[PDB]
């Protein structure tokens, strides 16, 4: 129950990184399109 | 000290319009706006002067033209002052050369903080606009500007008037901003028009794309490059989806 | 085709006009548009504000500077030679009766039928918000012309430099129907002509289309079968990519 | 500025000394020497009054804003943020946010931008509103 809390900390880091990656793939893709046009 | 020139949307667009059209001959004009403290140069508006092929020279800046135009500006409620000049070079980059310097210098003796703005519209097709902002040594606030500090004191003491670049920022306005994006019901009419006429002709559009496809399949057999074969198939698939969608 | 092409510079200069003249309370602000329109394709390339003063209980009282058009045009000529008189601009948001009297003024000084460009400045329309009209004989009456963007290769990159299908098409259509309906309800109030004739016609020409859509479906069904094949050809290139990857992966493990 | 550094955390007195300087040079503004004199006085006052709502200090610095000097105002704006760090006035937030949007001076906007971030310190979800405004 105290245990559970310890496991939540490790879980919480993963959820935050996992959601952040999604946002990143999407920005990277637009930037990839424009930059190719720039070269 | 640090200097930051805000060039506006409507200024950019007048500079670029004029300068592209004058080609290969140079066009120069006066930048209108206001100076604020020592940290902000606003360019709000811009008009063209007469054209020059000689590189822009001191005999060449129409004393009459700028006076005559301003008097008319005045009655349409443009009352803010000249803060500098902009000039084109197509073919030469975004820089000074000695003739510009002598031009520039004369302006500064009038003003005290004037900026020279150079556009190159050959580098405005690098898919960004290259634009620069310059001022000579002019001091009276630039006395902290070009482990140090011996250098610059001696630099302004050995020579007054030597170029330096300045930083660029663009500040703009939300109605200007929305206008730029609504470029891209006439709209409705056009998209739909093409859709209709695509559907009329599709009987033929069908046939040619099987032939392209037939080719593609054959190429890959020999091949057993890859990117090219894929792209050709991708175009054919994209087009079909759009075509099913149309009806 | 009859066409107008309008610089962004034109419309942003209009955007600036309306604030820069402090014109407020849905009054008129007036300037001149310039370009080349000797032809039947209007190219609008430049513009200028014109001093304009309106009275607050009369819009048929106007003050407009005739000398300014003439005098500024000469300055325009000395600067570039592309920048001739073709028409004028107003802040809209509709046509006026008073629009004619000003249009009549510009008619002498143009070399084509004078163009009235209505630039909406409130930016609360859909799409390109500007509608372009040309005065001809009917009295005298304004008539819509197609108004589209312009391009110059530097200018379009600069427009982007500053800023850096089906659902829309359909939504805009229903929007239209809704507006057509509003106008009809208003007319019905007024009654108890051109419009009516148009409504009847449309109707005559969903219902009539119904039968033909049935034929379209058999041809569309062939197109879907085509799609099926196309996915398979693409699928072939994708598969190849996975093998190449595989070979590399296996070699990597070994070393 | 430095006098605020040393004497941060004992600045009960240091506020009362510098505020007299602040009243002086709200008054005098037109030469370069007084602008800089007050820019340091204002970084320095914000350190002295740190974290304790002294509303008298809030008013003295606030007159510096109206004089519309890029040198003094950058300091002044940051100073108000340091002082009213913690819970702060409802007023202070609102007045300051608004004055940023109006300003044509760069240094001041930045100064008030940072100024509001500071006012928030442990205020949790109750600051969420200004965050949206700012973004």
Which of B170, B237, B244 is the closest to C223 by Cβ?
Answer: B244
What does the alpha-carbon distance between residue D63 and residue D49 come to, in Å, rounded to a whole number?
A: 17
Decide if C220 and B175 are in contact by the 8 Å CB cutoff: no
Of B37, B167, B170, which to mutate for an interface test with D (greatest number of D Cβ within 10 Å)? B37
Chain A residues within 8 A of B127 when measuring between CB atoms? 34, 37-38
Q: Is residue B126 part of a domain?
A: yes
Can you read off the two tokens belonging to residue C169? Answer: 């098409």
Q: Is residue B179 part of a domain?
A: no
What does the alpha-carbon distance between residue C130 and residue C145 come to, in Å, rounded to a whole number?
A: 11
Q: Is B168 helix (H, G, I), strand (E, B) or coil?
A: strand
Chain D residues within 8 A of B36 when measuring between CB atoms? 104-105
- Domain housing B51: 2-170
How many angstroms from the chain centroid is the CA of residue C118? 10
Q: Please tell me whether residues B192 and B74 are part of one structural domain.
A: no
Chains A and D touch (3+ CB pairs under 8 A): no
Measured from the Cβ of residue C219, the count of other Cβ atoms closer than 10 Å reads 13
Resolution in A: 7.7
What does the alpha-carbon distance between residue C178 and residue C125 come to, in Å, rounded to a whole number?
A: 16
Q: Is B27 helix (H, G, I), strand (E, B) or coil?
A: strand
D45 close to D79: Cβ distance less than 8 angstroms: yes
Q: Where are the alpha helices (DSSP H) in chain C?
A: 8-20, 66-79, 99-106, 153-163, 166-191, 194-204, 207-254
Domains: count for chain B: 2
How many angstroms from the chain centroid is the CA of residue D65? 9
D115 close to D84: Cβ distance less than 8 angstroms: no
Decide if C169 and B121 are in contact by the 8 Å CB cutoff: no
In DSSP notation, C117-134 reads EE---S--SSSS--EEEE
Chain B residues within 8 A of D107 when measuring between CB atoms? 39
Nearest CA of chain B to the CA of A9: how many Å?
Answer: 43
Q: Is residue B199 part of a domain?
A: yes
Q: Please tell me whether residues B209 and B243 are part of one structural domain.
A: yes
Omega within 30 of 0 (cis) for the link into D34: no
Q: Is residue B156 part of a domain?
A: yes
Q: Please tell me whether residues B77 and B143 are part of one structural domain.
A: yes
Fill in the DSSP letter of residue C112.
S
Chain C residues within 8 A of B243 when measuring between CB atoms? 223
Can you read off the two tokens belonging to residue C90? Answer: 């107003």
* Short-list D53, D56, D50, CA closest to D8: D50
Q: Please tell me whether residues B59 and B144 are part of one structural domain.
A: yes
Q: Is B89 annotated as a binding residue?
A: yes
Q: Is residue B175 part of a domain?
A: no
In the sheet that holds C140-145, the strands lie side by side as C140-145, C131-137, C115-118, C84-90, C30-36, C41-49, C3-6, C147-149
Chains B and A touch (3+ CB pairs under 8 A): yes
Q: Please tell me whether residues B205 and B166 are part of one structural domain.
A: no
User: Which of B170, B194, B211 lies at the terminal end of a domain, its last residue?
Assistant: B170
Q: Please tell me whether residues B141 and B199 are part of one structural domain.
A: no
Q: Does A38 lie at the interface with B, CB-CB under 8 angstroms?
A: yes
Decide if B39 and D69 are in contact by the 8 Å CB cutoff: no
First-last CA distance in chain C: 68
Q: Is B23 helix (H, G, I), strand (E, B) or coil?
A: coil
D74 close to D108: Cβ distance less than 8 angstroms: yes
CATH fold of C1-164 = Cytidine Deaminase; domain 2 (3.40.140)
What does the alpha-carbon distance between residue C37 and residue C190 come to, in Å, rounded to a whole number?
A: 40
| Technique of determination | cryo-EM
Chain B residues within 8 A of A34 when measuring between CB atoms? 127
Which residue of chain B is at minimal alpha-carbon distance from D104? B36
How many angstroms from the chain centroid is the CA of residue A28? 12
Q: Please tell me whether residues B110 and B195 are part of one structural domain.
A: no
What does the alpha-carbon distance between residue C119 and residue B183 come to, in Å, rounded to a whole number?
A: 13
What does the alpha-carbon distance between residue C30 and residue C23 come to, in Å, rounded to a whole number?
A: 10
User: Which of B141, B170, B199 lies at the terminal end of a domain, its last residue?
Assistant: B170
- Taking CA atoms, D22 is separated from D15, D59, D66, D109, in Å, by 10, 10, 13, 20
Q: Is residue B180 part of a domain?
A: no
Decide if D69 and B36 are in contact by the 8 Å CB cutoff: no
**Chain D residues near any Cβ of chain B (below 8 Å):** 69-70, 104-107
- Considering all CA atoms of chain B, what is the largest pairwise distance in Å, rounded to the nearest integer? 80
Chain B residues within 8 A of A37 when measuring between CB atoms? 127
Decide if D70 and B4 are in contact by the 8 Å CB cutoff: no
Q: Please tell me whether residues B128 and B161 are part of one structural domain.
A: yes
Q: Please tell me whether residues B151 and B192 are part of one structural domain.
A: no
Question: Could you tell me which chains touch chain C, where touching means 3 or more CB pairs under 8 A?
Answer: B
First-last CA distance in chain B: 64
Nearest CA of chain B to the CA of D53: how many Å?
Answer: 32
Looking at the DSSP bridge assignments, the partners of residue C148 are C5
Decide if C75 and B72 are in contact by the 8 Å CB cutoff: yes
What does the alpha-carbon distance between residue B176 and residue C16 come to, in Å, rounded to a whole number?
A: 8
Q: Please tell me whether residues B162 and B90 are part of one structural domain.
A: yes
Q: Is residue B37 part of a domain?
A: yes
Looking at the DSSP bridge assignments, the partners of residue B41 are B5, B35
Can you read off the two tokens belonging to residue C63? Answer: 């003050």
Which residue of chain B is at minimal alpha-carbon distance from A36? B127
């Amino acid at each position: 129950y105290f245990k559970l809390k310890k496991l939540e900390k490790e879980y919480e880091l993963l959820t935050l990184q996992e959601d952040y990656i999604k946002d990143e793939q999407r920005h990277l893709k637009r930037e990839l399109k424009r930059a190719q046009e720039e070269v | 000290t640090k200097e930051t020139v805000y060039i506006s949307s409507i200024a950019l667009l007048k500079m670029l319009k004029h300068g592209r059209a004058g080609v290969p001959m140079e066009v120069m004009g006066l930048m209108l706006g206001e100076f604020v403290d020592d940290y902000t140069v606003n360019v709000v508006d811009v008009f063209a002067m007469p054209q020059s092929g000689t590189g822009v020279s001191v005999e060449a800046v129409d004393d009459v033209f700028q006076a005559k135009m301003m008097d008319m500006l005045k009655q349409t409620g443009r009352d803010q002052m000249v803060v500098g000049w902009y000039h084109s070079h197509p073919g030469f980059g975004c820089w000074l050369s000695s003739v510009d310097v002598n031009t520039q210098k004369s302006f500064e003796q009038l003003n005290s903080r004037a900026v020279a703005v150079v556009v190159d519209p050959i580098q405005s097709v690098k898919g960004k606009v290259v634009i620069d902002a310059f001022r000579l040594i002019d001091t009276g606030a630039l006395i902290n500007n070009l482990l140090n500090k011996a250098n610059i004191q001696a630099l302004i003491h050995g020579l007054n008037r030597h170029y330096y670049s300045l930083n660029i920022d663009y500040h703009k306005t939300a109605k200007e901003t929305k206008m730029l994006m609504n470029l891209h019901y006439e709209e409705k009419e056009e998209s739909n028009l093409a859709a209709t006429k695509s559907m009329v002709k599709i009987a033929e559009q069908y046939s040619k794309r099987i032939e392209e496809e037939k080719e593609l399949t054959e190429e890959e057999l020999k091949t057993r490059p890859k990117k090219h074969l894929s792209e050709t198939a991708d175009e054919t698939l994209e087009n079909n989806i759009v075509s099913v969608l149309t009806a | 085709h009859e066409k107008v092409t309008i610089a962004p510079l034109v419309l942003l200069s209009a955007l600036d006009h309306y604030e820069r003249t402090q014109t407020k309370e849905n009054k008129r602000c007036v300037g001149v548009i310039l370009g080349d329109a000797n032809s039947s394709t209007i190219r609008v390339t430049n513009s200028f504000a014109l001093p304009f003063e309106e009275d607050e209980k009369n819009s048929d009282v106007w003050f407009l500077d005739h000398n300014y058009i003439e005098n500024m045009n000469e300055m325009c000529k000395k600067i570039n030679a592309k920048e001739k008189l073709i028409g004028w601009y107003h802040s809209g948001p509709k046509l006026r009766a008073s629009d004619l009297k000003i249009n009549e003024l510009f008619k002498k000084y143009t070399q084509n039928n004078p163009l009235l460009l209505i630039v909406d400045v409130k930016q609360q329309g859909v799409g390109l918000p500007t509608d372009a009209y040309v005065a001809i004989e009917q009295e005298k009456t304004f008539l819509h012309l197609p108004c589209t963007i312009e391009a110059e290769e530097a200018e379009e990159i600069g427009v982007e430099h500053l800023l850096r299908i089906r659902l829309t098409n359909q939504l805009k259509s229903l929007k239209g129907l809704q507006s057509k309906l509003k106008d009809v309800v208003e007319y019905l109030d007024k009654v108890i002509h051109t419009i009516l004739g148009k409504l009847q016609d449309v109707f005559n020409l969903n219902n009539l289309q119904k039968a033909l859509t049935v034929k379209t479906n058999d041809e569309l069904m062939v197109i879907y079968i085509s799609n099926l094949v196309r996915s398979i050809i693409a699928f072939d290139d994708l598969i190849e990519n996975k093998i190449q990857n595989k070979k590399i992966q296996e070699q990597r493990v070994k070393d | 500025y430095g006098l605020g550094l040393i004497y941060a955390g004992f600045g009960r007195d240091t506020t009362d000394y510098l505020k007299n300087i602040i009243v002086e040079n709200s008054g005098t503004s037109g030469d370069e020497d007084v602008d800089v004199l007050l820019h340091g006085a204002s970084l320095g006052i914000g350190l002295a009054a740190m974290g304790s709502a002294n509303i008298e200090v809030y008013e003295a610095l606030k007159e510096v804003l109206y004089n519309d000097s890029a040198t003094s105002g950058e300091a002044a704006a940051l100073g108000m943020g340091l002082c009213m760090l913690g819970t702060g006035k409802p007023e202070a937030i609102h007045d300051m946010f608004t004055y940023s949007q109006e300003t044509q001076h760069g240094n001041i906007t930045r100064g008030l931008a940072v100024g509001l971030a500071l006012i928030n310190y442990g205020r949790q979800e109750l600051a969420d509103d200004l965050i949206t405004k700012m973004l």
